[PDB]
Amino acid sequence: AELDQLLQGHYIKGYPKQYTYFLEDGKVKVSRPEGVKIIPPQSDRQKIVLQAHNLAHTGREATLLKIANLYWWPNMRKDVVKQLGRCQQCLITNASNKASGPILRPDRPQKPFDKFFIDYIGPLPPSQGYLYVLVVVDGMTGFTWLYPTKAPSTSATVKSLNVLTSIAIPKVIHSDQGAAFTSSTFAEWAKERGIHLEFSTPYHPQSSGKVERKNSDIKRLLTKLLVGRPTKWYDLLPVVQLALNNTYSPVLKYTPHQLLFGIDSNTPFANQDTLDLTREEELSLLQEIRTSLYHPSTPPASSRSWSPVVGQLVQERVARPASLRPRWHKPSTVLKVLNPRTVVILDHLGNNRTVSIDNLKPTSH
Amino acid sequence: AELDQLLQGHYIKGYPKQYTYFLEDGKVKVSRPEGVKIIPPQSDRQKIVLQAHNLAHTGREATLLKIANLYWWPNMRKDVVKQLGRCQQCLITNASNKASGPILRPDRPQKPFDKFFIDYIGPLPPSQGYLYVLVVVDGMTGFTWLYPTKAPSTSATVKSLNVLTSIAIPKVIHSDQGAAFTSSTFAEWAKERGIHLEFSTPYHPQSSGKVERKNSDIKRLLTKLLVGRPTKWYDLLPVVQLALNNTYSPVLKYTPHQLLFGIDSNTPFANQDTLDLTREEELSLLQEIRTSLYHPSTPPASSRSWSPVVGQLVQERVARPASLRPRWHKPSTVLKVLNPRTVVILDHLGNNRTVSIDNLKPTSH
Amino acid sequence: DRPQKPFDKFFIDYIGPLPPSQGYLYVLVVVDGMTGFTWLYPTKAPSTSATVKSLNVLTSIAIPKVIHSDQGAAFTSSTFAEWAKERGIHLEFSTPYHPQSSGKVERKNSDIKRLLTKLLVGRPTKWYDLLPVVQLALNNTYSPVLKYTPHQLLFGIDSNTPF
Amino acid sequence: DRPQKPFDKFFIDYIGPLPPSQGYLYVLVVVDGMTGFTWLYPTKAPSTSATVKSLNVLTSIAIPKVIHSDQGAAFTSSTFAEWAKERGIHLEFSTPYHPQSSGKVERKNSDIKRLLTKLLVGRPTKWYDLLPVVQLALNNTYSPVLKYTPHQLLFGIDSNTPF
DNA sequence: ATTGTCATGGAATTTTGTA
DNA sequence: TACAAAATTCCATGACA
DNA sequence: ATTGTCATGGAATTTTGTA
DNA sequence: TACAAAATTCCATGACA
Numbered sequence A, B: 001a002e003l004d005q006l007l008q009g010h011y012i013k014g015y016p017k018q019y020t021y022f023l024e025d026g027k028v029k030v031s032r033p034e035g036v037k038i039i040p041p042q043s044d045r046q047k048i049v050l051q052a053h054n055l056a057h058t059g060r061e062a063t064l065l066k067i068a069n070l071y072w073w074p075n076m077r078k079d080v081v082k083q084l085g086r087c088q089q090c091l092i093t094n095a096s097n098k099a100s101g102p103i104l105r106p107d108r109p110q111k112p113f114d115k116f117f118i119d120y121i122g123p124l125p126p127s128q129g130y131l132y133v134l135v136v137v138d139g140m141t142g143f144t145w146l147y148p149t150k151a152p153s154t155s156a157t158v159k160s161l162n163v164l165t166s167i168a169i170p171k172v173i174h175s176d177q178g179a180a181f182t183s184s185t186f187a188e189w190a191k192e193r194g195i196h197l198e199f200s201t202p203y204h205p206q207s208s209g210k211v212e213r214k215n216s217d218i219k220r221l222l223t224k225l226l227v228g229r230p231t232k233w234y235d236l237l238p239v240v241q242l243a244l245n246n247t248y249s250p251v252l253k254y255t256p257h258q259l260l261f262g263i264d265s266n267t268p269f270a271n272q273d274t275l276d277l278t279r280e281e282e283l284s285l286l287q288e289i290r291t292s293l294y295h296p297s298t299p300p301a302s303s304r305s306w307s308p309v310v311g312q313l314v315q316e317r318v319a320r321p322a323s324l325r326p327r328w329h330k331p332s333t334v335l336k337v338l339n340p341r342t343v344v345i346l347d348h349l350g351n352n353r354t355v356s357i358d359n360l361k362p363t364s365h
Numbered sequence C, D: 001d002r003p004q005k006p007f008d009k010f011f012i013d014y015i016g017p018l019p020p021s022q023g024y025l026y027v028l029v030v031v032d033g034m035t036g037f038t039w040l041y042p043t044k045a046p047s048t049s050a051t052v053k054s055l056n057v058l059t060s061i062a063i064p065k066v067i068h069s070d071q072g073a074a075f076t077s078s079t080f081a082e083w084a085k086e087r088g089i090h091l092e093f094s095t096p097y098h099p100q101s102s103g104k105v106e107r108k109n110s111d112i113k114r115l116l117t118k119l120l121v122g123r124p125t126k127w128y129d130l131l132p133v134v135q136l137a138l139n140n141t142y143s144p145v146l147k148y149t150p151h152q153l154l155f156g157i158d159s160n161t162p163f
Numbered sequence E, G: 001a002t003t004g005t006c007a008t009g010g011a012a013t014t015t016t017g018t019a
Numbered sequence F, H: 001t002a003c004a005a006a007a008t009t010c011c012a013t014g015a016c017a
């Protein structure tokens, strides 16, 4: 219908006059700068697009270029984009081209024992029949306990933490979501002691960074001690623990041990500045050192970042994606924006999931 | 000796007068802004440093801070740095903090068949008993051949390339250093045809980027075709090949097929601009299109890059580093700087190795 | 009307039965109408099935607008018809017994036969392995008219193996 | 001369034989001289070997400048001597039979005994599991003098489990 | 002797149809 | 001879294990 | 409901010892 | 009231699989 009057020379919103709209083979044609193109009827158009796109599932420009060979009509890209937004396959397969916003730098825990971060390293080469190391970093001081285990398992973790929590009980233990800690046995152990468990977002180690960064120090120091020799880490663990707790951070200008104790034990090169002050005068200088520690601010956002908006179509990264399968889940919607980097989504389907944005892409179109 | 006259108040190059240098417990002491420090004799000093450093194998500042607790002397950091340069263990274990210089963007091969890049994808899920795909990208056009194989093996590769090289023989075949191509059987096949073999630097896929980037397109298109269905890639390969060779690059504004043939086959949405020109007039417009393609320039260097200098101490990344072992080889020296990103080193020991700088760190101190 | 171009017509034919080579018996012959570019495919039988397998191979590279052939049982089959209809290829048959094709094509379609025989005497068991070398040879022969190789007409460049 | 500080002296002693708990028989007692902080370690015997295993554990956290003890066979041993010499710990022994230690330490070293007995009656088989709860309890008891917990004197903070 | 690449979709820029 | 909106070009982001 | 971190060694900056 | 060189602080880079 809307193509009869055009041949008759009448104006139709969107079709520039000055180009002559003739007829050949019973198809409406137009003579354009780029060439002679067929204008298909409105009803035919969505079909045409889908076909162009389906040749290789190409994005906006690549699809348009195909279509432009044979056809013209007004606002072509509009119909293309519309179609791409509805292609299940591309939505779940294509990568992001938008990076997540700047990371946050959570405030340092205020007092020691406010927060422990924990994690397992390994499997390592069998040393004395032990394969894994439980690592416990105090959040405030960076002080670290090491425990060797036979498996990254709740029972092992409890055994070690029972020893540890003789010195003191923490307010909060932060861990990743590995079977060891997500177990109901662990929750129960913690609830017995009034220790709050808190979990990183799934598949996101940045959140456990205070521990994970310490695993690297451990693994690097052990390695160095083992050059030449057979990998016999078991007997070294204590030495590494002591070594590390007593190492200066060039930025803080203190060792974990210092920040925990306000005075050095009887180790090599023990600092002697406070030797003249009563323990009391020592303990309050320490009180003050701890508050005035360096603290990083968040970096600037990259030119093409994105932030989660409540109610935004969003997709979550597939966990352990099989070979040849899509790298993304179907779309889901943002429910609460907890901070600019953590989000609650209604997923597949429909459970509440607390996820990191690094594991999300904003569904496009 | 050089400590007697100092107590006697005489000047010794490097020891600032204005600080009083007294004696206690038979150790020379000085009263400094920071506190009261022991000055050890020259002969004792290297020992002292080594000990500080060996507690945790700490770098410059972290080692210095330990030493500064008990001792002072002139130019402390100088002796520290000297020691760190000689610590075998740290040299081979510590990471880099210097990134390699900007990548190069090699000139696009001039004519088709000047250069093929090749590579194997997989293992994939068994489809018709086939597990691997041989991918062949023509350097100039981006045109791509796909061949399914049972193993990423010379024999397979030869079989497929015998079929391919019926169309035309390339000047140069570029590949990675995987067993398939580094085999003497392959060298011999190539020498039979006057095809020059050329190899990426070991453990560096950027060099095969023209292929590797195409593997991604293949894997992504196959994936999309397989949503819902069982992974039956064998029958799809041809369709993907055709699909891909006929897809526009939004930057070039052409399909591989176009750049190889200068005219579209009988596919969907085949371009018809040249329909009026003789084949000759077509073939020379093509000649000209090919020369005038977009070509990227190299990006700017990051503030902290490094370049290889002939004769520079340099270390090569360990291949398949075992658990708990050093991530770096012992030091080796640069022999020729081939371009700012590829280097010839005398290694372990001593063979000539042509390596990429991404797989090197400049030995520090 | 519009000048002759590659992929406008593909002239196909069967050659054989030949002596068995690697358990193959026939060659499918595919010459491009415009350029004289030739593809050879080894088959076990002059059947629709074998044709389709072979042409599936060829049509990952390029799809002709028209395939021309004689009225051989393998081409006049209804499977083959549906095959071409799928790909939007138009089928064109010579009348039976007076099997015309392009003058340039005959010139070519004749060379191959000569070339294959020169090869088949003395080495009748090994012809499978030499097909690529044969192909490269036909595609890089100077046409006495035009004086471009088929290779040159298809790719608009000199070949790395010239004859 | 210089004021008393944590890690200056560690007073160590053995308690037991106790009823077998998880196949353990003795507790090694380690009280910090300055703070009154207490560490307990379960052992199978009051032997040098057991002491060393236990104290290796403690000395990954902190190394005392001086360990004080009675002249028990386990401490006066030459292995134990070399052990401490390795770590640069000075060994200090009370004269035999008149075994003095700090006034604050006795106060403490006495509490433990009382506490352990209150626990050992009614539950003599299970004392291994309760050691941590016992420790937390001693370390977070108000000193009648100073009125800081040992916990507070060691860490300069309030504890999350107060008594 | 050897060397990164390029589809993708918002955003930035340029062109278009009309005055 | 200057406008809004469409068309095009720019280009950071990420994936080839 | 939760959140990146920090040793390392050149380079950039600030302080020091002396006038 | 000003210099060269030492001491210190800055900070991108990379690794916790």
Ligand SMILES: COc1cc2c(cc1Cc1cccc(Cl)c1F)c(=O)c(C(=O)O)cn2[C@H](CO)C(C)C
Binding pocket: B119, B120, B176, B178, B202, B203, B204, B205, B206, B209, B212, B213, E004, F016, F017
């Ligand atoms: C980074 O880890 C990789 C190691 C790869 C590959 C790919 C990647 C990821 C990556 C892939 C492709 C392109 C780019 Cl530029 C890229 F960064 C190969 O693709 C490949 C082959 O045999 O083809 C062999 N390797 C081996 C190790 O098994 C070595 C060459 C390290």
Ligand SMILES: COc1cc2c(cc1Cc1cccc(Cl)c1F)c(=O)c(C(=O)O)cn2[C@H](CO)C(C)C
Binding pocket: A119, A120, A176, A178, A202, A203, A204, A205, A206, A209, A212, A213, G004, H016, H017
């Ligand atoms: C990026 O790939 C990783 C996945 C990791 C981990 C580490 C890395 C590399 C990495 C490591 C440490 C810190 C940072 Cl900041 C970092 F980037 C763990 O360390 C870990 C654990 O169980 O402790 C579990 N995962 C699992 C997958 O098996 C998931 C959490 C993805």
Ligand SMILES: [Mg+2]
Binding pocket: A119, A120, A176, A178
């Ligand atoms: Mg873990």
Ligand SMILES: [Mg+2]
Binding pocket: A119, A120, A121, A212, A215
């Ligand atoms: Mg970890």
Ligand SMILES: [Mg+2]
Binding pocket: B119, B120, B176, B178
């Ligand atoms: Mg490979």
Ligand SMILES: [Mg+2]
Binding pocket: B119, B120, B121, B212, B215
């Ligand atoms: Mg690859």
Ligand SMILES: [Mg+2]
Binding pocket: C013, C014, C070, C072
């Ligand atoms: Mg026939």
Ligand SMILES: [Mg+2]
Binding pocket: D013, D014, D070, D072
């Ligand atoms: Mg005793």
Ligand SMILES: [N+]
Binding pocket: A106, A107
């Ligand atoms: N925070």
Ligand SMILES: [N+]
Binding pocket: B106, B107
């Ligand atoms: N080049």
Ligand SMILES: [Zn+2]
Binding pocket: A053, A057, A058, A087, A089, A090
């Ligand atoms: Zn799609």
Ligand SMILES: [Zn+2]
Binding pocket: B053, B057, B058, B087, B089, B090
């Ligand atoms: Zn070292």
